[PDB]
Amino acid sequence: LPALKLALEYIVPCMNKHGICVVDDFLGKETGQQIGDEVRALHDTGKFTKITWIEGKEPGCETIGLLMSSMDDLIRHCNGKLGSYKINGRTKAMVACYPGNGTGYVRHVDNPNGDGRCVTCIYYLNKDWDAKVSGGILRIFPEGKAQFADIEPKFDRLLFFWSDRRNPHEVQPAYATRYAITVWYFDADERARAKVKYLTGEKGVRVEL
Ligand SMILES: Cc1nc(Cc2ccc(F)cc2)c(O)c(C(=O)NCC(=O)O)n1
Ligand SMILES: [Fe+2]
Numbered sequence: 001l002p003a004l005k006l007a008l009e010y011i012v013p014c015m016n017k018h019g020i021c022v023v024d025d026f027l028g029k030e031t032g033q034q035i036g037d038e039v040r041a042l043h044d045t046g047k048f049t050k051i052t053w054i055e056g057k058e059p060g061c062e063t064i065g066l067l068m069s070s071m072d073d074l075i076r077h078c079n080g081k082l083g084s085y086k087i088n089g090r091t092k093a094m095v096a097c098y099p100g101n102g103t104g105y106v107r108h109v110d111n112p113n114g115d116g117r118c119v120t121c122i123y124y125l126n127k128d129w130d131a132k133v134s135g136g137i138l139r140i141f142p143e144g145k146a147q148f149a150d151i152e153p154k155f156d157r158l159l160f161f162w163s164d165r166r167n168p169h170e171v172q173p174a175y176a177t178r179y180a181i182t183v184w185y186f187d188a189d190e191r192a193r194a195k196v197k198y199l200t201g202e203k204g205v206r207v208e209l
Contacts, residue, residue: 007074007078007081010023011023011074011078015078019162019166019167020140020149020160020167021161024154024157025156027066027067031066031067035063035064035066036125036155038064039125042054042095051094051096051097052095053093053094054092054095055093064095068093071123071158075087075119087118087186089186089191090184090186091183091186092183093182094181094183095179095181097177097179098177100134102173102175104136104170105170107141107170108169110167111163114164115194116193117184118163119162120159120184121184122138122180122182123182124153125180126153129152129178131150133175134174134176136172136173136174136176136178137152137171138170139170140169141169142167153179163184
């Protein structure tokens with residue numbers, strides 16, 4: 001499926017109706033496990049600062065760059081059709097590792113105070129993942145509805161959801177190494193407002209004395 005067809009037929013319609021969207025088999029087995037290798041390479045060489053921020057052009061991060069390009073393409077076809085949002089940019093790629101010792105992440109909202117991020121995009125890298133045993137379910141609690149969404153961190157799966165208070169979510173305890181890559185997309189207007197009240201942007205960068 002072309003990017004234009006996945007945006008206009010699956011992602012945008014789904015986002016505007018539910019605000020939670022799952023695209024399985026996004027890149028394919030061969031590209032998927034290439035990313036899996038590059039992600040494991042970040043751990044082997046010990047670049048995990050376990051989260052680490054990747055730009056996509058770094059050596060040995062070519063396929064992660066491909067993923068980021070593929071993600072951008074997809075949003076680029078969505079632009080001006082997602083609510084009343086104008087995506088004007090994104091964060092770098094957050095590569096995250098749940099070590100598999102029974103750690104998870106408590107219920108939270110990604111962007112509760114309007115720091116500019118409107119869409120969370122997550123790519124999962126976990127082959128043959130069975131949540132019944134290994135855990136690691138992402139549970140989203142969509143605002144208003146009397147029901148939750150359960151999302152397995154299934155290999156080669158791409159997830160979109162609104163970053164704001166509409167989508168509180170938790171990562172349940174994981175008993176197996178659990179890998180994901182996240183990018184957040186910025187709305188022009190909210191980002192403009194954010195840059196005015198919060199220590200975000202270029203100005204939010206530490207300088208040494
Ligand atoms: C704001 C935030 N930050 C992190 C970074 C982090 C990773 C590991 C960790 F242990 C502690 C923090 C997240 O992972 C998530 C999230 O919703 N993840 C869903 C998923 O990966 O399915 N949200
Ligand atoms: Fe989150």
